[model samples]
Target: MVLSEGEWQLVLHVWAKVEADVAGHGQDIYIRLFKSHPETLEKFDRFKHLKTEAEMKASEDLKKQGVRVLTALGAILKKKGHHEAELKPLAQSHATKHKIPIKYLEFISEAIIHVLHSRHPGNFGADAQGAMNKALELFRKDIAAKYKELGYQG
Candidate 1:
């Protein structure tokens, strides 16, 4: 998907808010995911013990993990459509070493869409969603290419 300059601007605008408070925004994304899809929490061993929303929110481990996610997302935003260079290796690493399924990537993309809307309901409308969807689609395409290159049959 070819995003217009205006759309790119919107994408950057949305990310600017997230960049300003990466920890807070990142935490909100994961917390929202947990709330909306409790089964999602089962994937993370570190967070499985949290049990309650309050415990998950207060978790120092979750803070660190969330920051790490936001930092990576910041890098992704900078890379933009040129995700092949940055995402390829990371994709392979996550798939091979960490055993992170491609489905989780898709889920994260969906979660981010909701998080962006939830974060700025007024600002994040159709255009914002389009930009984000385009960005994530590009990332997923490049990542899938690399995954295929790695002899992934799954």
Candidate 2:
């Protein structure tokens, strides 16, 4: 997924929050993901070796990223943009490419929302529900476009 800096920060920040909240399972899944997709480690060098120092460094980086994503999200809200909804198609394509169940991606999205709502309030606000509705629509549109690009049929 070719994420903008803000988007990637959101992904990492949300994952970090999930790992902190759920502890065992959350951390384990991240470990498993790195192991299964070793190339993914390059995106997060601090987590590459799974060292204590590295995890600690990654945690610090995550905090910074969280702040960055929050700023971007705030900007998006102010602009009345639907960038968050754009995640759906990328997520679906990720699932399709990896042959993983879409449920996992959904779980990630849930975790992101949970963290955003709990840690940073007043962001989603009144537009939250409507924005989320648009996300699904955007995802569907992206899925069709992706399928066409790949020359695949339903």
Candidate 3:
């Protein structure tokens, strides 16, 4: 997706916060995802057993996986518009191994946006929010393309 100068700045602003607390922010994203779409958690074997909030929080595997996700997103942010080349393998693996749909990643993006808004209410304005949305849309589309090419039913 094409991002304007202001949008790039907005992305960088959000990126700094994400990088600052990868674990906490990452967990927040996954928590929101589970709350919104419980079925999606089934794809994550490490977190499938976590039925309770306490169990989710207590799981080290969940925490590490969350960080890995956030770190991948961080790489996307750093890559700017060139993230497709980076995210393709992840999409392929999830599609082939877990049958996880690209749509689920899109859902995670929404969860991430929600958590970021909640965490930085005052800092994240409309421009930043819109930029994040567009960014994720682009990211999702790229992954979805690869997923579709792989003949993933989801």
Candidate 4:
């Protein structure tokens, strides 16, 4: 349910490299996410109107949002299972106020893994991916729990 010390250490180490270029790496992640599920664009009011690849790429809002998304991930990683304190309100905001479905969160996590493996092939190994996957799963679990409580119940 929780990451072992070694798992956390390995993931934290590899993630440090990403932190150095949060803007570039984060943007790549969202681009990968948007490409994986174009409908996700509609979930974002600011980005919903972006219809072309060039349009998405050129959107400054996406860039700002990409940075924010990555920064939130970093904050969660730093806290480990204690993520509850950070994730609860975020779940409330996105699930209830923003109307984002759990599927979108799941897809974003998938996109993060794909982007990590593709962008950092040399550094992101099986161990890191496995650990990172577990971490993301835990995050999804908690947020999904809140969604069931406060948002869509289907």
Best by lDDT: 4
Instruction: Give me the overall lDDT of model 4.
Output: 0.84
RMSD of each: 1.9, 10.3, 1.3, 1.4
- The segments of candidate 4 whose C-alpha lies over 4 angstroms from its true place after superposition are none
In order, what lDDT does every prediction score?
0.78, 0.44, 0.82, 0.84
Q: 1 or 2: which has the higher lDDT?
A: 1
Candidate 3 segments exceeding 4 Å error: none
Scored by Cα lDDT, where does model 3 land? 0.82
Q: Which residue pairs in model 1 clash with each other?
A: none
Looking at model 3, which ten-residue stretch has the lowest summed lDDT? Answer: 1-10
Name the weakest run of 10 consecutive residues (lDDT summed) in model 1: 77-86
TM-score of each: 0.87, 0.35, 0.93, 0.93
Residue-level lDDT tens digits of model 3 in 62-108: 88988998888788877877776787788778889888776787788
lDDT of 1 by residue, 5-106 (tens): 777778888888888888888788888878877776877877887788798789988988999987877787776566556777687777676666667778
What's the lDDT for residue 63 in model 3? 89
Candidate order by lDDT, decreasing, is 4, 3, 1, 2
Q: Pairs clashing in candidate 3?
A: none
Clashes of 1: 0
Any residue pairs clashing in model 2, and if so which?
none
Q: Which regions in candidate 1 have their CA more than 4 angstroms from the true location?
A: none
Clashing pairs in 4: none
